Paper text:
The present X-ray crystallographic and virologic study demonstrates how SARS-CoV-2's main protease (Mpro) inhibitor resistant variants emerge when SARS-CoV-2 is propagated in VeroE6TMPRSS2 cells under inhibitors’ selection pressure. The X-ray crystallography data with mass spectrometry data obtained in the present study clearly show that all three Mpro inhibitors specifically bind to the enzymatic active site of the enzyme through the formation of covalent, polar, (and halogen) binding interactions, causing the dimerization of two enzyme protomers. Each inhibitor blocks the entry of the premature viral polyproteins into the active site cavity, thus presumably blocking the enzymatic processing and maturation of the viral polyproteins. In conclusion, the present data show that the structural changes in the target enzyme (e.g., Mpro in the current work), which certain amino acid substitutions bring about, compromise the enzyme’s integrity (e.g., protomer dimerization and the following structural changes), loosen the binding of potential therapeutics to the enzyme and cause resistance.
When propagated with another Mpro inhibitor (5h), SARS-CoV-2 acquired A191T, became resistant to 5h, and gained improved replicability. We thus attempted to elucidate structural changes potentially caused by the A191T substitution in Mpro using X-ray crystallography. 5h readily formed a complex not only with MproWT, but also with MproA191T. In the superimposed structures, both enzymes exhibit an identical binding mode, with slight deviation of the loop region around the indole moiety caused by A191T substitution. In MproWT, the distal ring of the indole moiety of 5h interacts with the α-carbon of Ala191 at a distance of 3.6 Å and in the A191T variant, this distance slightly increased to 3.7 Å. The shortest distance of 3.2 Å was measured between the side chain of the hydroxyl group of Thr191 and the distal edge of the indole ring of 5h molecule. Although this suggests anion-π interactions between the hydroxyl group of Thr191 and the distal edge of the indole moiety, the side chain of Thr191 might sterically hinder the entry of the indole ring. X-ray crystallographic data also showed that the interactions of Ser1’ and Glu166 of MproA191T complexed with 5h were virtually the same compared to those of MproWT complexed with nirmatrelvir or TKB245. Interestingly, 5h presumably bound to MproA191T but with predominantly one 5h molecule bound and elicited its dimerization to less extent compared to the cases of nirmatrelvir and TKB245 examined with MproA191T (Right). The less-binding profile of 5h to MproA191T is in line with the structural features showing that A191T substitution disrupts the interactions between the distal ring of the indole moiety of 5h and Ala191, pushing 5h molecule away from MproA191T, resulting in less anti-viral potency of 5h with MproA191T.
Author numbering:
A (entry chain A), B (entry chain D): 1 to 305
The structure:
């Protein structure tokens, strides 16, 4: 027992990280098979950054302008192209450590692990959720671009995220591995605003189930509610509306624990209206929304890779 | 910017995890060079577990009774011995993935990463602190024994923890890699109580520095205090006494931010006496004590491995 914010083991992704240098800009890339993926603004200089013409910068580049290093070793670049906000560099050597992988685009509310890297080297790993406003609450400094987010299913790495920018509020934005941004952001050196964020209701409920499983059960109350009545309260506290699909995906946890989903919703309503009165749940004084239902089951049942 | 509970990249440790089976008991082991380390109570069955005579059980075992598997491959056991609560199995093949490593015994308040494993396979990675009462607040189920905790410094893995048991209150206890428990616990199937725990004051202060660096500054007050006056308050709120060494190690953060250590202490005092009034710091509604000063600097400055 116990309940922690747990990341996936990072080893399979660690062996894919490289450094990509153009002019004096260095960022991280992802070496899979004979292709290296990285943010396209590696091709930017300090004068190009406010409103770059990436088509114009790229046509002028040559293969030999891109310095790709995998640890101590230079890779030879034999072709290049741009896909949305990502550059693809073809190199003459397939990565021998390439895992089984796929590229996925995740939905808001879904979770993934980030391997923060600098200069093609790992710094650390942590779990994130895609916020409803399409940001992530990450930890990234200068040089972190091209760090990736991922899930693992047995032996298959699903890459979902590549890091591009920090917004004013100190939250983070990036792309999928086809180079399309999550949210309405663009890769230019300019100020952009994340929308108002909301709390991921279905994850909060999943985590209340985790709490019950772990013996934290003080917040279970004597009430039930309806989806509609709960939603009146969710709108008030900036929670995502609960949908039928959400009720549905909480079904397994509900059956495991014998606590009906709408009874847990009633317990959540009371927590929102009454606060926590200085108490804690799973060691937190806030209601946690960065565990999905899948995450709770995985952790509470000990799934491995 | 941003500040997250960050684990070390787990790749170098993932390559060392194996499965060790005796009779019907399977737990995890750590394969370094030509030795496999695992909890000694792999040699227990259900009759032996309440008060095992490990000397008698081990003298009666032979090399061939221990089944060691790395992936789908059996390793051949060519010797065995016991050191405190750890069994050491000599095998005929040195682990080709052995990283640079050492064994360290850490002090209360220090942090490390856990790679939770089942059946010799990794499940997930998370950061823990050694609590003042020598427990850890982990996430471990049946089968997790022999999972290890570690720090990384450049290319060197310092192993500090091997998992052995869960205590009544849902916290966790284990040994260093020489098989000596942290705390007064023993490896027998019996109820044992952790002492009352206390908050790791120097870590709370480090995290308040992290907050200031990341722009969270509302709690900075207009007061200073002394070590002795602060300690009067720490005793009251079950905080570890702050010592001169603690003040000392906060020096770099203090110089970076221009906020004197005792001024930060005075800010902490006010937070303890007044509470947070429903506000948050680095997205937490509690004062977080599982980041060391070292951790804050590493994360805020982008150190890599
Ligand atoms: C990433 O590491 C990159 N750095 C560079 C440097 C030169 C060329 C290309 C790149 S990509 C970097 C990651 C950031 C830094 C701090 N935390 C992070 O997560 N990303 C950027 O610096 C990014 C580059 C753009 C070309 C996309 N810009 C921003 O994150 C950014 C720019 C602004 C801004 O511009 C006027 C105003 C406010 C906020 C802001 N963030
Ligand atoms: C670990 O995976 C092991 N399992 C076995 C099974 C058979 C033989 C040896 C071992 S080691 C296991 C990890 C636990 C399970 C749940 N969460 C964990 O972290 N450790 C144990 O099960 C451990 C074995 C002892 C021989 C050291 N025992 C306990 O954790 C334990 C025993 C008691 C108890 O006994 C009467 C009362 C209360 C609490 C308790 N915990």
């Amino acid at each position: 027992s116990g309940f922690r914010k747990m990341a996936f083991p990072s080893g399979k992704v660690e062996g894919c990280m490289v450094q990509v240098t153009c002019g004096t800009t260095t960022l991280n890339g992802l070496w899979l098979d004979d292709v290296v993926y990285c943010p396209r603004h590696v091709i930017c200089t300090s004068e190009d950054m406010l409103n770059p013409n990436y088509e114009d910068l790229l046509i002028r580049k040559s293969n030999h302008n891109f310095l790709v290093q995998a640890g101590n070793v230079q890779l030879r670049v034999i072709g290049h192209s741009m896909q949305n906000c990502v550059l693809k560099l073809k190199v003459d050597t397939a990565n021998p450590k390439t895992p089984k992988y796929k590229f996925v685009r995740i939905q808001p509310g879904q979770t993934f692990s980030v391997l923060a890297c600098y200069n093609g080297s790992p710094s650390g790993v942590y779990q994130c959720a895609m916020r409803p406003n399409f940001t992530i609450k990450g930890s990234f400094l200068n040089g972190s671009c091209g760090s990736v987010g991922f899930n693992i299913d047995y032996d298959c790495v699903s890459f979902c995220y590549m890091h591009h920018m920090e917004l004013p509020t100190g939250v983070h934005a990036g792309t999928d591995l086809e180079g399309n941004f999550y949210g309405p952001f663009v890769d230019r050196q300019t100020t952009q605003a994340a929308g108002t964020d909301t709390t991921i209701t279905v994850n909060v409920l999943a985590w209340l189930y985790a709490a019950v499983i772990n013996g934290d059960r003080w917040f279970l109350n004597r009430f039930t509610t309806t989806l509609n009545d709960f939603n009146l309260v969710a709108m008030k506290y900036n929670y995502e509306p609960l949908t039928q699909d959400h009720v549905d995906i909480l079904g397994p946890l509900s059956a495991q624990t014998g606590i009906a989903v709408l009874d847990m919703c009633a317990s959540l309503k009371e927590l929102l209206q009454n606060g926590m009165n200085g108490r804690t749940i799973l060691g937190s004084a806030l209601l946690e929304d960065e565990f999905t239902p899948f995450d709770v089951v995985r952790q509470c049942s000990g799934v491995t890779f």
